Amino acid sequence: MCLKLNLLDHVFANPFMNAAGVLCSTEEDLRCMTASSSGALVSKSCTSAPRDGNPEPRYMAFPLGSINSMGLPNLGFDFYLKYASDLHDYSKKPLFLSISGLSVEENVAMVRRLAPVAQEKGVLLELNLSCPNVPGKPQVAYDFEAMRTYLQQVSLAYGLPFGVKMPPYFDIAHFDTAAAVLNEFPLVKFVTCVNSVGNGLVIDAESESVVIKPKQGFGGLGGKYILPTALANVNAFYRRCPDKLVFGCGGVYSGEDAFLHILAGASMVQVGTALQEEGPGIFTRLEDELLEIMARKGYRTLEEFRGRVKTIE
Amino acid sequence: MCLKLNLLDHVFANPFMNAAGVLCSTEEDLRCMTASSSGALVSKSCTSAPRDGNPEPRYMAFPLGSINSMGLPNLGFDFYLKYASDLHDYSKKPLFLSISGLSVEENVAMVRRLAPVAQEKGVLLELNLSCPNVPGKPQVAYDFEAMRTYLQQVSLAYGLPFGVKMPPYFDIAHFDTAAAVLNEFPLVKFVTCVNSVGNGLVIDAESESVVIKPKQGFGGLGGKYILPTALANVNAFYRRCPDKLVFGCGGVYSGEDAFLHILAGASMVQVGTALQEEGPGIFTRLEDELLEIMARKGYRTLEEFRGRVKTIE
Numbered sequence: 228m229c230l231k232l233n234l235l236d237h238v239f240a241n242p243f244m245n246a247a248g249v250l251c252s253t254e255e256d257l258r259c260m261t262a263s264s265s266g267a268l269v270s271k272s273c274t275s276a277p278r279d280g281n282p283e284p285r286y287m288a289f290p291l292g293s294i295n296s297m298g299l300p301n302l303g304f305d306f307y308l309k310y311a312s313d314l315h316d317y318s319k320k321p322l323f324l325s326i327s328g329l330s331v332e333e334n335v336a337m338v339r340r341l342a343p344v345a346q347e348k349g350v351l352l353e354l355n356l357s358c359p360n361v362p363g364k365p366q367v368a369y370d371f372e373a374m375r376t377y378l379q380q381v382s383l384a385y386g387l388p389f390g391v392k393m394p395p396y397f398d399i400a401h402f403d404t405a406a407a408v409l410n411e412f413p414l415v416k417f418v419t420c421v422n423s424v425g426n427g428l429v430i431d432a433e434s435e436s437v438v439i440k441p442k443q444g445f446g447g448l449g450g451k452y453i454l455p456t457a458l459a460n461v462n463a464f465y466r467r468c469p470d471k472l473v474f475g476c477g478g479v480y481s482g483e484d485a486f487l488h489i490l491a492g493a494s495m496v497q498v499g500t501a502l503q504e505e506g507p508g509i510f511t512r513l514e515d516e517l518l519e520i521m522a523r524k525g526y527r528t529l530e531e532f533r534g535r536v537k538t539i540e
Numbered sequence: 541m542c543l544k545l546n547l548l549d550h551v552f553a554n555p556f557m558n559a560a561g562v563l564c565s566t567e568e569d570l571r572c573m574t575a576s577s578s579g580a581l582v583s584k585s586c587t588s589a590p591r592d593g594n595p596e597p598r599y600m601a602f603p604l605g606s607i608n609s610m611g612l613p614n615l616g617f618d619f620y621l622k623y624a625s626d627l628h629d630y631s632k633k634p635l636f637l638s639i640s641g642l643s644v645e646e647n648v649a650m651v652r653r654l655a656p657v658a659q660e661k662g663v664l665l666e667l668n669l670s671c672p673n674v675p676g677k678p679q680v681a682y683d684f685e686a687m688r689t690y691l692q693q694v695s696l697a698y699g700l701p702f703g704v705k706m707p708p709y710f711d712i713a714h715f716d717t718a719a720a721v722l723n724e725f726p727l728v729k730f731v732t733c734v735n736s737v738g739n740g741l742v743i744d745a746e747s748e749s750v751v752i753k754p755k756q757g758f759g760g761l762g763g764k765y766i767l768p769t770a771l772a773n774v775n776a777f778y779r780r781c782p783d784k785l786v787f788g789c790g791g792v793y794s795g796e797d798a799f800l801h802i803l804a805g806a807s808m809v810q811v812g813t814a815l816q817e818e819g820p821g822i823f824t825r826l827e828d829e830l831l832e833i834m835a836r837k838g839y840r841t842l843e844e845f846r847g848r849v850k851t852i853e
């Protein structure tokens with residue numbers, strides 16, 4: 228028995244990959260992710276030009292999870308484009324490239340350049356919809372009119388299947404609206420739920436201080452704190468987007484957590500905080516643990532249980 | 541060395557109270573909370589008419605917290621008004637009464653009738669701004685024009701100092717807008733942050749089932765999942781509303797969690813999931829734990845550290 232699957236016209240040895248931003252910023256990182264047992268990898272969300280990111284400390288983790296306000300540090304789009312075009316070994320696993328330009332125009336200009344490499348090599352685009360609206364306005368995914376516009380422009384500019392990275396929502400009306408917006412775009416073939424839970428605040432009791440330096444300690448939450456939120460978003464989008472795939476992201480530390488993501492509707496399962504903390508070894512463990520739960524339940528394929536979470540009455 | 545506080549023209553032996561909805565639905569519950577060592581109590585959020593609420597199971601708890609979709613079960617306004625005017629012993633501790641009408645008009649009629657009792661007995665109003673909107677719209681506090689509408693009419697109909705129970709926000713632009721709206725209303729003297737983290741989904745791996753019956757298993761999250769979110773919201777409002785009190789609510793299981801809330805700016809500190817799980821004995825433990833932390837740091841009163849969370853640079 229094996230966890231192999233096919234989607235977006237690619238083949239994957241297993242449904243696991245890193246979450247964008249974790250172990251994927253540098254050529255060394257991407258080489259490390261490629262040499263891992265993961266079924267795929269995704270590059271750090273990039274901008275046109277290189278960015279240093281925010282002052283450190285900017286990431287911290289704890290037994291229940293992590294907090295970060297990295298500030299989109301990245302080597303720049305030319306670098307990830309070149310990794311996709313000349314360096315990545317597509318015989319090893321598929322690659323996704325994440326983009327998070329600081330305006331619609333910057334994103335349009337990056338996707339136009341990405342298109343021919345996508346055609347030629349099969350790199351897949353994950354558009355990060357936590358990219359900024361503007362200061363003064365919520366991130367783009369929490370402003371449905373700007374979201375519709377980004378997607379209009381990117382679909383026109385890119386013209387090939389892509390996916391989107393979504394922030395979590397917390398209100399059923401917002402699931403209905405967000406998903407209807409996404410379903411206006413036939414080229415949006417996968418929806419990744421979720422990005423970090425925005426602007427939480429970790430305080431250290433001993434020092435009476437926040438733990439990261441940017442934004443007066445406020446930053447996005449990952450890890451155990453966000454698993455039920457992540458499952459709710461995957462399932463809400465899975466229900467509402469029957470002609471798309473959903474990729475689950477959030478609070479994956481075990482094969483069990485991955486199993487619940489898939490029950491919720493996930494096709495692929497991304498690993499952030501737990502990967503940052505444990506390292507790329509985690510993928511062999513996660514595969515073994517998911518195959519073990521499967522064997523005990525008698526499931527031979529992921530298809531047999533994906534999206535089959537039971538409701539009560 | 542003192543946990544005492546004086547606010548809103550009342551005296552409180554300590555900053556702890558139940559979170560609305562926990563251990564506060566029936567006369568028996570409210571007498572139990574009064575007999576406890578809590579510094580105050582709040583009644584279950586009520587509607588004009590009694591309600592049975594949603595079908596069961598509708599609440600479940602786990603090591604890292606709870607999920608609920610209770611559906612506002614409650615004995616009706618007349619019962620909580622009678623408890624406030626005739627049954628509560630104000631010599632023991634102060635009472636808050638929470639209301640959560642299903643329309644602006646329902647809220648207006650309850651506050652008109654609460655007003656004379658508030659004036660005469662000193663019962664304090666907590667207006668629940670997660671009260672449900674017209675369905676297919678977001679909850680009232682995620683719809684800034686509905687929120688403004690509710691607070692104008694309640695200010696007018698009530699005419700006395702009150703507070704508001706807020707859902708969590710996840711986006712800085714949302715903090716800024718919400719606090720600006722609250723700051724339009726001088727009678728809003730306290731802001732309770734936060735209500736449950738909306739529409740999470742808990743899935744049981746063994747049974748492959750959601751754990752609550754309503755809303756296909758979607759419900760609000762409390763407990764350890766939500767502490768950083770709750771701390772972020774406390775501090776965001778503490779900083780943006782210098783003329784109002786902030787009450788903290790979310791993820792309190794220990795004197796240490798309470799300490800972090802208070803550092804973030806909390807005055808009162810409410811306890812939901814951990815109280816539902818542990819019972820009212822929690823309050824003695826919480827007081828002893830918080831006093832132990834204070835003794836170790838040389839703090840003699842709450843005001844010596846309230847809101848004094850340090851940032852880095």
Ligand SMILES: Cc1cc2nc3c(=O)[nH]c(=O)nc-3n(C[C@H](O)[C@H](O)[C@H](O)COP(=O)(O)O)c2cc1C
Nearest residue numbers: 246247248272421422423449450477478498499500
């Ligand atoms: C250090 C760090 C960097 C991140 N960078 C990105 C990014 O560049 N783009 C992105 O879409 N999400 C990014 N995230 C969010 C993750 O991809 C993921 O959605 C989130 O951490 C929740 O998953 P987890 O619970 O497994 O951590 C980052 C997370 C962390 C912790």
Ligand SMILES: Cc1cc2nc3c(=O)[nH]c(=O)nc-3n(C[C@H](O)[C@H](O)[C@H](O)COP(=O)(O)O)c2cc1C
Nearest residue numbers: 559560561585734735736762763790791811812813
């Ligand atoms: C069973 C249950 C019932 C609740 N009912 C109410 C309510 O009637 N009104 C309200 O404002 N909040 C209600 N809440 C929210 C709690 O007041 C609190 O805001 C939330 O549970 C987070 O605090 P915690 O993490 O200590 O649980 C309820 C929570 C639970 C778990």
Ligand SMILES: CC(C)(C)c1ccc(CCc2c(C(=O)O)[nH]c(=O)[nH]c2=O)cc1
Nearest residue numbers: 296297298299300327357358359423447
């Ligand atoms: C330019 C600035 C407004 C500082 C900014 C733009 C875009 C992002 C998104 C990158 C990202 C980050 C990050 O790099 O801080 N962290 C996450 O948890 N998720 C993310 O999606 C983060 C920060």
Ligand SMILES: CC(C)(C)c1ccc(CCc2c(C(=O)O)[nH]c(=O)[nH]c2=O)cc1
Nearest residue numbers: 585609610611612613670671735736760
């Ligand atoms: C279950 C649904 C019909 C969506 C609903 C009705 C009413 C309320 C407000 C009461 C409330 C409840 C509740 O009674 O379900 N639970 C919370 O965690 N916080 C609350 O504020 C919250 C939720």
